[PDB]
Design goal:
Length: 259
């Protein structure tokens, strides 16, 4: 159905971002290397998890794949989602320390900061998702002919650290960054871009996490039919992070117009 366009555009945008990074020497700084790591974490979403959800949807929520890949597929989904969330959380914090005091950010501006930041966010993304192979693996991962999470203590308590803390950091960091920038037109264009990025992240991922948190804290068919669309809306963020984090730059616009 409409998810095929999501898969195709998720492939196309991330591939074009990777191709524009690879054969351009003007975009080789550390800030853009973190975005290359984001496109690495985002290419693998649309080819390893979303076709699996595709033929899960086309089979009427009865999974034709074998039962041995349920915990692995759930672990891949949680790993790529927490990676593509933590990437934006570290991007916002780096953007804050590069907006507040540019001198002390440019003092330590190197590839060492990018290596440490990528290592930290990937350690967080693996360490959040690592209990799913070792505690969920079939009652914690399989239910009624579909591969869905059912260990409610992990679904609630994992969503606290994997989303409601990095969302609290985006809230406090967007407040301080827009207060510092509000304290001229270049600055206001960055204010509009920051507002679009923040008000799209809290719109595209948040409904799934308040839906699953409310379903754990509490109408089962209504919550299931909401989850079956809000996961795909969560997948639509992977159709956007290649686009809206590069297309406001002139070099990336020229590179995309070249292809
Ligand atoms: C379905 N996908 C978007 C879930 C991503 C996710 C990140 N953290 C989680 C914690 C529990 C369940 C799912 C997730």
């Amino acid at each position: 159905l409409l998810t095929a366009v999501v898969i195709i555009l998720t492939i196309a945008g991330n591939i074009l971002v990777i191709m524009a990074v690879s054969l351009e020497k003007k975009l080789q700084n550390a800030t853009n290397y973190f975005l290359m790591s984001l496109a690495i974490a985002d290419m693998l979403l649309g080819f390893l998890v979303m076709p699996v959800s595709m033929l899960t949807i086309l089979y009427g929520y009865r999974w034709p794949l074998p039962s041995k890949l349920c915990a692995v597929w759930i672990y891949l989904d949680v790993l790529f989602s927490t990676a593509s969330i933590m990437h934006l959380c570290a991007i916002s914090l780096d953007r804050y320390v590069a907006i507040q005091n540019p001198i002390h950010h440019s003092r330590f501006n190197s590839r060492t900061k990018a290596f440490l930041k990528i290592i930290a966010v990937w350690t967080i993304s693996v360490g959040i998702s690592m209990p799913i192979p070792v505690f969920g693996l079939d009652s914690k991962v399989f239910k009624e002919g579909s591969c869905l999470l059912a260990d409610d203590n992990f679904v609630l308590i994992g969503s606290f650290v994997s989303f409601f803390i990095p969302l609290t950091i985006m809230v406090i960091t967007y407040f301080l960054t827009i207060k510092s920038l509000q304290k001229i037109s270049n600055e206001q264009k960055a204010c509009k871009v920051l507002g679009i990025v923040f008000f799209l992240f809290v719109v595209m991922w948040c409904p799934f996490f308040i839906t699953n948190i409310m379903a754990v804290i509490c109408n089962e068919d209504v919550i299931g039919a909401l989850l079956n669309v809000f996961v795909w809306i969560g997948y639509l963020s992977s159709a956007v992070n290649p686009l809206v984090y590069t297309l406001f730059n002139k070099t990336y616009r020229s590179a995309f117009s070249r292809y």
